[PDB]
Amino acid sequence: TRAVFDGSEKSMTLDISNDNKQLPYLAQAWIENENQEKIITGPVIATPPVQRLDPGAKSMVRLSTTPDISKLPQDRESLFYFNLREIPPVQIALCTKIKLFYRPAAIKTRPNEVWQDQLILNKVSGGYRIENPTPYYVTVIGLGGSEKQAEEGEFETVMLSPRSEQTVKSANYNTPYLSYINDYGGRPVLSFICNGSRCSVK
């Protein structure tokens, strides 16, 4: 659901398949920027745009970077979405979107480093203002009053941009807990300790 790249490889292929055992499908592929608008001008592209996949048949999509990848900020992450839509040739289709995180080598991490423990919760009316002081995107799943309640979250509540703040509507908890998705797809839980209006990771 997420791929991190640094632009050292100009191309990548994804394996796609028609999982429908009976009908043929067209598979449309395209890139969107972080605001989820289609971009056909780079700096990440996908080919081919369209292709027919017969029942049970396998194929691939090629993702490439263009020279304009180097005009992106080099001290923070940039986000793209790879989109796949499958429609038989009320329109009902299968639609997938994978998050592509452009992570410049200047901000490459070590595997035993957790930047997500720098999140701050600010107690505001009707919820919290979360600060992400890091150069990376932080995908939050659950926010609760216990590890259990944070672990139950089934969806991505909010996604925090590099070096940013966002307000989320939430009940005020004495002991706030939040789960996030890491680079490997896991969902660790953080516990916060509050001091009046501000809570930091224990």
Next chain:
Amino acid sequence: AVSLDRTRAVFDGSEKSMTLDISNDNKQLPYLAQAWIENENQEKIITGPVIATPPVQRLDPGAKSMVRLSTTPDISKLPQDRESLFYFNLREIPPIALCTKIKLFYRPAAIKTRPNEVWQDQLILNKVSGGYRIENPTPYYVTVIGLGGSEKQAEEGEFETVMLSPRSEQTVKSANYNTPYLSYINDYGGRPVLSFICNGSRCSVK
């Protein structure tokens, strides 16, 4: 699996908004429903002039809900003498999503119709080589769902559904019937069948 209450919608421009019912038919798991508007080119618009709220909502197992469609003040820049086409989109997110797209016809208040008013009987069928050049001289989109040499064939026969835009024409491949029968879908989901009389290459409704 989130489902919609209808397959097509008409936005009555004499109203400020309208609502669409959605329901989570999965009784076991919760889903997120993401809703957005597209323009006639199937391009996403998030500023107006037609908006869907909320953009994203949580549906609990078996829950029912709704999506509200509203106009911004920019809606007054669309043509007021013809309908405009938008698409209403719905994406379900499981805890491999499904995406539904219906047509949203925006009908300005100036061309508001009476409930038993028919305009699809103003289509003109022109016999061209290989078929018919169909003209829609009205301010509405008209969807033809069948064409044949009898009432039976217009309804029973398999036809490629063709949508005509306001005040335009489209050519469809077909046999040359002496007396053509055309079927369309109205705003109520009815499927009336028209019969044409051709004098020369021009056919109009009896």
